[PDB]
Amino acid sequence: ALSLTADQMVSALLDAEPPILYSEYDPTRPFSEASMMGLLTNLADRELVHMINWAKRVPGFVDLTLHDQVHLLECAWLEILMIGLVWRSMEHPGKLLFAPNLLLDRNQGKCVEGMVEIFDMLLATSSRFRMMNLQGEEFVCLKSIILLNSGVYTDHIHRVLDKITDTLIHLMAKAGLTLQQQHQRLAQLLLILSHIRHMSNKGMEHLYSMKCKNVVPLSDLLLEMLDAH
């Protein structure tokens, strides 16, 4: 974990990237609140399986006990899904690419009550990443930071998080940023993680809301994710 070079960290994280999955979108019928929510919960369900196996390839993660691995994923899973969504969406101004067959604008988000509020925040994050010209190497570093950090305050993890900071700075120096551009961009990227936390907490309250009004059935996995928060 700590014996890795920065280039080996980046390579390991890039090779661990999960695939982009398709939704179960049925183009034969109009959208409803229930059918939208069904697509998003089905998609999250299938993405979670890949996220679990991605997480075990995040250096430092497998060293943890199963209970600590559970806790970290329970804290971070929706943040991880949304930063991935925002990343997928960067090259689609004004839209969110939930899946290749589910590319939505905010007018389609109004189909689910309370969704447009979160939609707009994700759109704003995607344009922020686009304006900053976020790189895939930086993105995978941020997604690993979310995994290890979000549940950390609920020594070895902090050493690993420190290596990832080293890796981000290494990437920025290699890209030609001045020393002082380097720490400014590090701060900008890490401050976006507070907005991703915020978006997750909104998304988790919205999920609880749909579930409490019997809008869609949640899988046992999503039910236990909700129990944890």
Binding site: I52, L66, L73, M225
Partner: peptide, 9 residues
């Protein structure tokens, strides 16, 4: 938890 078993299988 499903998550506990998914992590080790």
């Amino acid at each position: 938890k499903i998550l506990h078993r998914l992590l080790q299988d």
